């Protein structure tokens, strides 16, 4: 750091660029720092901001911003550099005051300034209050509006959305303004629609081409960032609902249904996209979730998105890691969708629980979806087992006997104890009149079936 600052104080603009480029190359991949050189880093950080005040070529500005971004990884040196003037300089460099995008040579400076702002806001807590006092979210939204449809402005959009996500995750007043006073939902929905290039055939229907090409990494990143921001925007207020928001909540669900039927460049990107889509779908009110089905067919309908969700859940069940953060959202979404709509429940019942034909083996021994869901009912985690039992309970029209027919009393003891149905009975919601659905072989065997284990024993 000692050579650097010696030359930094010198005027000339070529030497500073070379020194800072060498420093960036040397420390490009360091994330651990020692307390011996804290003061030498602080002095250089203070000098960098002093340099940025004057007018210098773009190449020097990019190197200065890169060095500042590298140095911002340490929290201990961010105390004496978190004043208002520094943040004003950073905002001026990012064109958040100067809001013109007619020059193409200034884009990397904007990207670097946004990266530095993200790092500083995440690390420092005084920066959050300063951002609240400087009206940062409104200016970010103005930039997003100004970036409606142009070329070579993908990275600016991604990092603007990343800064919005950070701000809405860390602070609550900014979240409230984004939700109510700034109209963020239509803007983010328009961003998503432009990302997916959606053309409407009906009010809530979009044209699907099954032979279309996959997405691109740029569009995938933009969509992931937009979905992550939309999750934070709509999480604050969802228990209150009025008819004025139904149209906006239905357009979002239509867009997400379109999202659930495409693929990305690789399998990991596709799984990430679908996971974020499920996370966002978990927030929409249930009465507006009926636009997931269009007039795999059931009763003259299209039932493909539910099939995609079921395959996603099965593929995540197959692996044996991170059940709490990988299984609860999709299971909750499926349960809530089935509880309110009839066609979805009737389509899922004959796909998860076909009519019983074999009673020789135990319900938890096998390799079908039913066997996996029964095995999930005795986990050491509470939420996972509870939601897994609740899904199968809902699919059986909330009747105890139909549940004991398919899982057995031994595996269903937790739900019965929790809900008070431990001595038989039924739930509260009513669905329709009982019908017969029994296979002939089961009728012959039925008299010799054990209730606790739920199989025919020799």
């Amino acid at each position: 750091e000692e050579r650097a600052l010696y030359i930094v104080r010198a005027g000339e603009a070529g030497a500073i660029e070379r020194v800072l480029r060498d420093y960036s190359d040397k420390h490009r991949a360091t994330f651990k720092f020692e307390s011996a050189d804290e003061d030498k880093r602080k002095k250089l950080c203070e000098g960098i901001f002093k340099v940025l005040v004057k007018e210098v070529p773009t190449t020097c500005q990019v190197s200065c911003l890169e060095v500042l971004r590298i140095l911002s990884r340490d929290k201990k040196i961010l105390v004496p550099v978190t004043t208002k003037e520094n943040m004003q300089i950073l905002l001026r460099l990012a064109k958040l005051h100067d809001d013109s995008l007619e020059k193409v040579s200034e884009f990397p400076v904007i990207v670097e300034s946004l990266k530095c702002l993200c790092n500083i806001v995440f690390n420092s807590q005084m920066a959050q209050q300063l951002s609240l006092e400087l009206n940062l979210a409104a200016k970010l939204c103005n930039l997003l509006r100004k970036c409606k449809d142009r070329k070579f402005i993908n990275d600016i959009k991604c990092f603007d959305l990343r800064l919005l996500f950070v701000l809405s995750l860390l602070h609550t007043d900014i979240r409230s303004q984004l939700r109510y006073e700034l109209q963020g939902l239509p803007l983010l929905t328009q961003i998503l629609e432009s990302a997916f290039s959606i053309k409407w055939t009906d009010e809530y229907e979009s044209a699907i081409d099954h032979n279309g090409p996959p997405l691109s990494p740029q569009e995938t990143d933009c969509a992931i960032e937009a979905l992550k921001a939309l999750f934070n925007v709509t999480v604050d207020s969802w228990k209150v609902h009025k008819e004025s928001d139904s149209h906006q909540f239905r357009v979002m669900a239509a867009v997400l249904r379109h999202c659930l039927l495409i693929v990305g460049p690789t399998e990991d990107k596709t799984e990430e996209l679908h996971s974020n889509a499920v996370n966002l779908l978990s927030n929409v009110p249930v009465s507006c979730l009926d636009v997931l089905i269009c007039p795999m067919v059931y009763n003259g309908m299209n039932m493909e998105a539910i099939h995609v969700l079921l395959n996603f859940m099965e593929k995540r069940i197959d692996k044996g890691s991170s059940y709490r953060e990988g299984l609860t959202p999709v299971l909750s979404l499926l349960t809530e969708c089935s509880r309110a709509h009839r066609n979805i429940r009737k389509f899922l019942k004959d796909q998860v629980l076909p009519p019983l034909r074999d009673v020789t083996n135990r319900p938890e021994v096998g390799s079908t979806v039913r066997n996996k869901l029964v095995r999930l009912m005795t986990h050491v985690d509470l939420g996972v087992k509870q939601i897994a039992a609740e899904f199968l309970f809902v699919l059986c029209k909330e009747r105890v006997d139909s549940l004991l027919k398919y899982t057995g009393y031994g595996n269903a003891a937790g739900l019965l104890a929790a809900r008070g149905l431990l001595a038989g009975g039924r739930g509260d919601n009513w669905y329709s009149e009982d019908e017969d659905t029994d296979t002939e072989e089961y009728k012959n065997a039925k008299p010799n079936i054990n209730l606790i284990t739920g199989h025919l024993e020799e």
Binding site: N119, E325, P329, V380, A413, A417, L451
Partner: protein
Amino acid sequence: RLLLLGAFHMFDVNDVTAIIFVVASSSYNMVNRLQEALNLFKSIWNNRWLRTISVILFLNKQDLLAEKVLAGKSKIEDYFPEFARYTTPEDATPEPGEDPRVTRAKYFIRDEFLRISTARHYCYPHFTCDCRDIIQRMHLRQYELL
């Protein structure tokens, strides 16, 4: 009828179908209290008159166990010496969003009961004692500095 030996028509204390057994999971450091429960379970499981009756096992007060494990004032190794060399089974599931100590304690406590039964009737253990907060906590842990 279902008998309730722990502390349809269920009665406490030949028409028996299943047995429900209730123990407190957080009593590992009381003078032990899990040792008496395990001895009672071994006594009731090996009875010749109950060779065809299944057992359903309930393990409650899980949050108190988690708090006691996280406190650090008491350790399982001071009461169960075999815990030092214990290794997780092959059907365990890692949880990156939780402290490994409580997961190891839960698996050890379950296996203590399970090995007695495994070494025809069967046993079913159940642990007894929000989606928005799970996702929010995940976002804060996986954030990477630029």
